[PDB]
């Protein structure tokens, strides 16, 4: 299930993952309040802001 980063986000510790606008990523799940989601990129994984991503081809 493929998403794309809308905005840049730099990891800030606590298992967050940096993402670059334009970057593709797979989403594994959301936290309880939906504010964070667990993302897998080719070359890392960790939590990113749900609001910073959108599905591909939507």
């Amino acid at each position: 299930n493929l998403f794309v980063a809308l905005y840049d986000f730099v990891a800030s510790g606590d298992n967050t993952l940096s993402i670059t606008k334009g970057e593709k990523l797979r989403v594994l799940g959301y936290n309880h309040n939906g504010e964070w989601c667990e993302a897998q990129t080719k070359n890392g994984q960790g939590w990113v802001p749900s609001q910073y991503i959108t599905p591909v081809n939507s």
Binding site: L6, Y7, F9, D14, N15, T16, N31, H32, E35, W36, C37, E38, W47, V48, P49, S50, Q51, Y52
Partner: peptide, 10 residues
């Protein structure tokens, strides 16, 4: 996931 808030969208 972190307990704190993510940053708002820019």
């Amino acid at each position: 996931a972190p307990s704190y808030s993510p940053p708002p969208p820019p």
